[PDB]
From Swiss-Prot:
Coiled-coil region list: none
Organism: Methanothermobacter thermautotrophicus (strain ATCC 29096 / DSM 1053 / JCM 10044 / NBRC 100330 / Delta H) (Methanobacterium thermoautotrophicum)
Matching PROSITE patterns: AP_NUCLEASE_F1_1 (PS00726), AP_NUCLEASE_F1_4 (PS51435)
Binding positions (Mg(2+) 1): 11, 37
Protein family per UniProt: Belongs to the DNA repair enzymes AP/exoA family.
Co-factor(s): Mg(2+)
Reactions accelerated catalytically: 2'-deoxyribonucleotide-(2'-deoxyribose 5'-phosphate)-2'-deoxyribonucleotide-DNA = a 3'-end 2'-deoxyribonucleotide-(2,3-dehydro-2,3-deoxyribose 5'-phosphate)-DNA + a 5'-end 5'-phospho-2'-deoxyribonucleoside-DNA + H(+); Exonucleolytic cleavage in the 3'- to 5'-direction to yield nucleoside 5'-phosphates
Record EC number: 4.2.99.18, 3.1.11.2
Role summary: Involved in DNA uracil repair. Recognizes DNA uracil residues within double-stranded DNA and initiates DNA-U repair by endonucleotic incision on the 5'-side of the 2'-d-uridine residue, irrespective of the nature of the opposing nucleotide. In addition, acts as an apurinic/apyrimidinic (AP) endonuclease hydrolyzing the DNA phosphodiester backbone immediately at the 5'-side of AP sites, and as a 3'-5' exonuclease. Strongly binds to double-stranded DNA.
Miscellaneous comment text of the record: The insertion of the side chain of Arg-208 into the DNA helical base stack seems to be crucial for the uridine recognition.
Keyword match Lyase: yes
Residues at the catalytic site: 150 (proton donor/acceptor)
Lineage, opening ranks: Archaea, Methanobacteriati, Methanobacteriota, Methanomada group, Methanobacteria
Top-rank taxon: Archaea
Protein name in UniProt: DNA uridine endonuclease
């Protein structure tokens, strides 16, 4: 059977809701929909957002109000839903949904970002580590994994408009690029680069300069599967026409 999964850093759900998010949701009709940066507290959401017809909905808010948060809409509910890696300082910021769909585990992650300081960076990298360890334990037990969401890092030079002036800014630091190397070398696949080899493919553009209309952007949103499972991924694309956020959605399509 074909399964369509979408992943989107919505940059505040309320905000994307005001730009026809429901219209588009109903149009595309994916089997699972992963969301990052809900920003709003779930018990505050317009009811039509929390109660979408045909979809059970899962919300994982941060402690801070107005901040972070992840969400998942799925036609068929999972066996269970985890909201953490098991290390405290990472699990309390509503960044983690690990949902068990029997055939695979679905990681909906909103990774942090290492900007403004070194501690911020340290936390991002330690987060990366805690995630890698978590996904490996699950994979080593013979489970198949799908990781999607905002990784906050463009992998290679081919993954952003301006690499040269950015390699000392967080998002493209060699350290951050080095991790994605490690991550892959542990047995995981950037699904999109399985089918697309072109440059100029982005998932985020700065609102601040109308960067999208020029396509001066970054690829920060990824779908990852474990190598043993790549045979079953049919499509992996970027829905770059879909407006409403500073990120656009990206999609995965799998078999059985
Ligand atoms: Mg954002």
């Amino acid at each position: 059977a074909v399964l369509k999964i979408i992943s989107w850093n919505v940059n505040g759900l309320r905000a994307v809701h005001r730009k026809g998010f429901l219209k588009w949701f109903m149009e595309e009709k994916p089997d699972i929909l992963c969301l990052q940066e809900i920003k709003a507290a779930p018990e505050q959401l317009p009811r039509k957002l929390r109660h979408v017809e045909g979809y059970r909905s899962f919300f994982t808010p941060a402690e801070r109000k107005g901040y972070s948060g992840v969400a998942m809409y799925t036609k068929v509910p999972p066996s269970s839903l985890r909201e953490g890696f098991g290390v405290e300082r990472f699990d309390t910021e509503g960044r983690i949904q690990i949902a068990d769909f029997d055939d695979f585990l679905l990681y909906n992650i909103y990774f942090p970002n290492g900007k403004m300081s070194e501690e911020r960076l340290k936390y991002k990298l330690e987060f990366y580590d805690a995630f890698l360890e978590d996904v490996n334990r699950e994979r080593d037990s013979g489970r198949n994994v799908i990781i999607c969401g905002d990784f906050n890092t463009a992998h290679r030079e081919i993954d952003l408009a301006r690499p040269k002036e950015n390699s000392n800014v967080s998002g493209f630091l060699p350290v951050e690029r080095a991790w994605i190397d490690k991550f892959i070398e542990n047995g995981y696949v950037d699904t999109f680069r399985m089918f697309n080899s072109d440059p100029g493919q982005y998932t985020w553009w700065s609102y601040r300069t109308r960067a999208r209309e020029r396509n001066v952007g970054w690829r920060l949103d990824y779908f990852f599967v474990n190598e043993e499972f790549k045979g079953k991924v049919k499509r992996s694309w970027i829905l770059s026409d879909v407006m409403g956020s500073d990120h656009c959605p990206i999609g995965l399509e799998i078999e059985l």
